[PDB]
Amino acid sequence: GTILLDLAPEDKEYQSVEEEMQSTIREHRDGGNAGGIFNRYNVIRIQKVVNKKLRERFCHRQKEVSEENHNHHNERMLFHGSPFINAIIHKGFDERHAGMFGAGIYFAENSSKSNQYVYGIGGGTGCPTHKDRSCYICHRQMLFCRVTLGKSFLQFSTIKMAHAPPGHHSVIGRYAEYVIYRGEQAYPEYLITYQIMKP
């Protein structure tokens, strides 16, 4: 099954991920409505996710994508946030649960943007305990994942697509939203447990 590797705060790895999480905070059109109001996370712990089977599907899909894209993975580390993280680290991303660019699995370069989703679309009703979307008490989680974009399609309006266009493997949707339509194309590498910190 899935085991979690407990990175150390003094790990050059750990540090690299918190810096990506910390440096990609930004302001959002909703004025902090969904994700709450903060300038910085209090990173409780960072964990590397290890799953035999998920690595295998990810590796296998990696080859097909490659053959169809001048033999390049075109992989990327992107943040994903969801109320579904527990199932994702245990069974991987599932497009059968899959928006502005169709029935896909969404990622983004800004940790803050994924933060909006940890309690659901538009932040839902905030933490279960304090019903607070800006809650500074409750621990949140997100994922820094390896994503196989393959040959990306670029959409510029909103479109309801089920799969990437032929010859493509992902959709970059315009801030850009990274969308794949196959779970295998993302592995959930880093489980991040954190708090938003009152400014």
Contact set with Zn ion (CB under 5 A): 127, 129-130, 132, 135, 137-138
Please state the residue numbers annotated as binding site.
Answer: 127, 130, 135, 138
Residue 130 binds which entry of Zn ion, ligand 1XQ, none, CB below 5-8 Å type-dependent: Zn ion
- Can you tell me the distance from the alpha carbon of 105 to that of 14, in angstroms, rounded to the nearest whole number? 25
- Minimum Å gap between C-beta 120 and ligand 1XQ is 5
Residue 94 binds which entry of ligand 1XQ, Zn ion, none, CB below 5-8 Å type-dependent: ligand 1XQ
- Partners of residue 196 on adjacent β-strands: 41
Pairing of strands 140-148, 186-197: antiparallel
- Can you tell me the distance from the alpha carbon of 166 to that of 188, in angstroms, rounded to the nearest whole number? 26
- Can you tell me the distance from the alpha carbon of 85 to that of 117, in angstroms, rounded to the nearest whole number? 11
Contact indicator for 110, 103 with CB cutoff of 8 Å = no
- Can you tell me the distance from the alpha carbon of 104 to that of 179, in angstroms, rounded to the nearest whole number? 6
115-134 binders of ligand 1XQ (CB under 6 A) = 117, 120-121
4-63 binders of ligand 1XQ (CB under 6 A) = none
Does 174 engage in binding with ligand 1XQ (CB under 6 A)? no
Residue 8 or 159 with smaller CB distance to ligand 1XQ: 159
Tell me the three state secondary structure of residue 190. Answer: strand
- Can you tell me the distance from the alpha carbon of 83 to that of 141, in angstroms, rounded to the nearest whole number? 9
Q: Which of 5, 7, 39, 33 lies closest to 21, judged by CA?
A: 39
Does 82 engage in binding with ligand 1XQ (CB under 6 A)? yes
Residue 11 or 50 with smaller CB distance to ligand 1XQ: 50
- Minimum Å gap between C-beta 178 and ligand 1XQ is 7
Does 105 engage in binding with ligand 1XQ (CB under 6 A)? yes
Contact residues toward ligand 1XQ (CB under 6 A) are 79-84, 87-88, 93-94, 97-99, 105-108, 113-114, 117, 120-121, 177
